[PDB]
Amino acid sequence: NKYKRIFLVVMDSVGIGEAPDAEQFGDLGSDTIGHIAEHMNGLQMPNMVKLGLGNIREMKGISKVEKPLGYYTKMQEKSTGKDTMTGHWEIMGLYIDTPFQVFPEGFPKELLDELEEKTGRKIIGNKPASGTEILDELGQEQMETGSLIVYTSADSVLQIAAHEEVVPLDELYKICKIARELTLDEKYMVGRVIARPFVGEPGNFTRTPNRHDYALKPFGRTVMNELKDSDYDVIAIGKISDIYDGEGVTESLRTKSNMDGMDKLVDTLNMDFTGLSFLNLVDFDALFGHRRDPQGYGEALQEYDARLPEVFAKLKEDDLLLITADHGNDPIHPGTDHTREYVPLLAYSPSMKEGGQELPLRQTFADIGATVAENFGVKMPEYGTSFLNEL
Numbered sequence: 001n002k003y004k005r006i007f008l009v010v011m012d013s014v015g016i017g018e019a020p021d022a023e024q025f026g027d028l029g030s031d032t033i034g035h036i037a038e039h040m041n042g043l044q045m046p047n048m049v050k051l052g053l054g055n056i057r058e059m060k061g062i063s064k065v066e067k068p069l070g071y072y073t074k075m076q077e078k079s080t081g082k083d084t085m086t087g088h089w090e091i092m093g094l095y096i097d098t099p100f101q102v103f104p105e106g107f108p109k110e111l112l113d114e115l116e117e118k119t120g121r122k123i124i125g126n127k128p129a130s131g132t133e134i135l136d137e138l139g140q141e142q143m144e145t146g147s148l149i150v151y152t153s154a155d156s157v158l159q160i161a162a163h164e165e166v167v168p169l170d171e172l173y174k175i176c177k178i179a180r181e182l183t184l185d186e187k188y189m190v191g192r193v194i195a196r197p198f199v200g201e202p203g204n205f206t207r208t209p210n211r212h213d214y215a216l217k218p219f220g221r222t223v224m225n226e227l228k229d230s231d232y233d234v235i236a237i238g239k240i241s242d243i244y245d246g247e248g249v250t251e252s253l254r255t256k257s258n259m260d261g262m263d264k265l266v267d268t269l270n271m272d273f274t275g276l277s278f279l280n281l282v283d284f285d286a287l288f289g290h291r292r293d294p295q296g297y298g299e300a301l302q303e304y305d306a307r308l309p310e311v312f313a314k315l316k317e318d319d320l321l322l323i324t325a326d327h328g329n330d331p332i333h334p335g336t337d338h339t340r341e342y343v344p345l346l347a348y349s350p351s352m353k354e355g356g357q358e359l360p361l362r363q364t365f366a367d368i369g370a371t372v373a374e375n376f377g378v379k380m381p382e383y384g385t386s387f388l389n390e391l
């Protein structure tokens with residue numbers, strides 16, 4: 001093998017400008033990093049600059065360098081969707097024709113009626129809301145009627161909330177399994193069905209740790225699947241394991257923030273393993289992208305960049321670092337959904353003694369999976385062109 005360990009970092013939603021097909025998604029003028037850089041009056045990311053982020057595209061405070069540490073380019077998404085599942089599944093060697101849906105006006109009547117008819121329970125709510133806001137509004141009604149609080153977020157989820165003393169956990173889990181079967185439908189395909197049990201009284205409701213997720217498996221066997229079957233290590237950090245529904249994962253590390261995510265990346269650098277370490281930094285998307293907060297987004301990027309020098313110091317000669325994104329989420333853009341954007345790609349190894357160069361534009365996210373697969377000599381994915389030999 002050329003590289004013993006590959007460390008892949010997904011900076012979630014950190015796009016680098018509108019894709020060629022952005023108009024179809026209503027995403028013209030979208031530019032995640034660029035608008036953040038403009039808002040911040042110059043983004044302070046000297047370590048990403050040294051890798052060659054500005055060499056991909058120059059933005060305010062992000063300039064190009066003569067000798068970048070590693071190789072640089074951007075990737076174009078080939079799959080139909082701009083959601084998290086689609087992005088991550090493509091990265092690992094798949095092509096997804098059927099996009100996952102978001103529901104800013106609530107779920108369609110047809111789906112809710114069929115869920116009512118199958119469960120024998122009424123449905124209240126049907127709108128985007130946080131866990132705290134929806135329980136204060138409809139929690140008391142739920143307790144008194146025995147109905148189900150169905151709600152969503154800015155992402156592709158269907159959440160069902162019910163009181164543990166009123167609706168038993170096992171009954172709530174069975175309802176979510178039915179909801180999962182009904183949402184395996186093109187008209188209303190959700191990425192994740194989430195059980196949201198809660199306890200307490202009107203005025204003081206609290207969500208219990210009895211939360212259960214019901215996700216879909218990737219539409220095809222991934223490079224992660226092939227690595228695991230060939231006895232390689234596949235360490236998932238953050239929400240990576242959940243996104244792939246555990247497929248191809250040998251070990252999973254839970255994180256609570258971006259800084260905690262970088263701590264667990266440092267933990268894997270200290271581990272004697274052979275294979276892939278896979279990190280997702282979710283804060284960019286969940287906290288700032290969807291909430292349209294360019295200031296908080298900007299600060300988070302600067303906080304992330306300041307952690308990189310320690311990562312550079314720990315990388316060995318046979319280690320490869322890959323930094324990318326799964327889609328865009330422009331914090332200065334209409335609505336609450338993601339943006340169809342190019343994603344940056346940086347590939348760095350300390351063994352690159354004379355630095356890196358420009359790679360050809362990656363026509364699919366699957367080029368990463370193809371590179372990972374060729375490196376470890378496992379079955380090549382159906383989609384993607386490896387850039388291993390260019391490095």
Ligand SMILES: O=P([O-])(O)O[C@H]1O[C@H](COP(=O)(O)O)[C@@H](O)[C@H](O)[C@H]1O
Nearest residue numbers: 129130131132153154155156157286
């Ligand atoms: O808790 P996570 O990170 O798994 O987040 C989970 O629930 C969130 C709701 O947030 P809230 O609690 O404010 O309603 C969703 O947006 C997200 O898709 C889901 O993975």
Ligand SMILES: [Mn+2]
Nearest residue numbers: 025026027334
């Ligand atoms: Mn848009």
Ligand SMILES: [Mn+2]
Nearest residue numbers: 012013084326
């Ligand atoms: Mn994402």
Ligand SMILES: [Mn+2]
Nearest residue numbers: 155285286338
């Ligand atoms: Mn999102």
